[PDB]
Amino acid sequence: HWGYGKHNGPEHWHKDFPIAKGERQSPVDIDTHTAKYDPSLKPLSVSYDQATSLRILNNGHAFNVEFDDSQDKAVLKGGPLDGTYRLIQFHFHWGSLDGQGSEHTVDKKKYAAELHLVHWNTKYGDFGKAVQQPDGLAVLGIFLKVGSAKPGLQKVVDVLDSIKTKGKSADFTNFDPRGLLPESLDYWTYPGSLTTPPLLECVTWIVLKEPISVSSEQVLKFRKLNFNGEGEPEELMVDNWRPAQPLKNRQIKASFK
Numbered sequence: 001h002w003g004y005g006k007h008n009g010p011e012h013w014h015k016d017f018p019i020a021k022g023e024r025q026s027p028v029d030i031d032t033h034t035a036k037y038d039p040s041l042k043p044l045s046v047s048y049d050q051a052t053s054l055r056i057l058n059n060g061h062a063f064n065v066e067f068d069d070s071q072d073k074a075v076l077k078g079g080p081l082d083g084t085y086r087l088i089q090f091h092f093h094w095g096s097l098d099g100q101g102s103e104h105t106v107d108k109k110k111y112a113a114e115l116h117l118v119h120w121n122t123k124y125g126d127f128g129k130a131v132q133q134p135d136g137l138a139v140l141g142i143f144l145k146v147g148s149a150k151p152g153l154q155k156v157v158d159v160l161d162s163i164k165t166k167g168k169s170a171d172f173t174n175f176d177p178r179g180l181l182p183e184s185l186d187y188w189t190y191p192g193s194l195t196t197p198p199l200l201e202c203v204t205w206i207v208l209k210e211p212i213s214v215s216s217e218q219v220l221k222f223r224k225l226n227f228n229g230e231g232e233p234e235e236l237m238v239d240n241w242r243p244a245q246p247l248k249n250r251q252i253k254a255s256f257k
């Protein structure tokens with residue numbers, strides 16, 4: 001099956017998922033000088049006050065913090081979006097070392113990690129229907145750099161020991177994702193894809209300019225997770241990022257001057 005190794009990593013995914021070589025693949029390098037300021041772009045509206053987290057899952061490629069998406073409780077709108085997108089899950093991508101781990105890059109800079117808050121367009125009714133549409137998802141991407149601790153991340157860090165291996169889940173209620181946001185909601189946006197199989201071209205990407213800081217100890221705990229299942233040979237869950245893909249016929253727009 002697909003993964004992040006020599007024999008099953010990103011350079012192999014096109015064999016099972018030919019859209020890997022498509023016209024709107026993610027992630028991309030954000031060339032800050034070429035991104036055009038678009039005064040028509042609206043402020044992002046992040047409404048997470050009623051978010052209901054339920055569970056955290058090690059799915060063998062990352063860990064997902066899952067939300068109740070059976071009502072408009074945690075929604076993204078505005079920015080480049082038409083209509084309302086409901087939060088379903090967030091997860092991260094990270095490196096074996098602090099000098100790599102992000103999926104998007106900024107003028108070729110790689111951050112230590114990248115947070116993806118995944119939302120689906122309510123006009124398609126369910127996540128599974130939304131991923132079949134070119135405007136089905138909105139993913140809010142936030143870079144992580146290593147420095148000061150992020151206090152709002154620590155509850156996530158401390159549950160990871162309970163989901164070390166693939167297929168383990170734990171109850172994870174009352175987690176407030178507002179504690180993972182930077183101060184500024186300035187962003188870049190472009191049309192792209194899921195960054196893991198099935199690589200569907202269904203995402204409006206919204207990548208925040210301002211990173212969050214996490215401590216070395218916080219990211220070190222991400223790197224103790226395992227790709228393998230319990231009682232299998234230990235393979236540390238590190239370098240679970242897809243590198244930048246060709247921009248092709250796309251424009252990256254900036255919300256800010």
Ligand SMILES: [Zn+2]
Nearest residue numbers: 091093116195
């Ligand atoms: Zn992701």
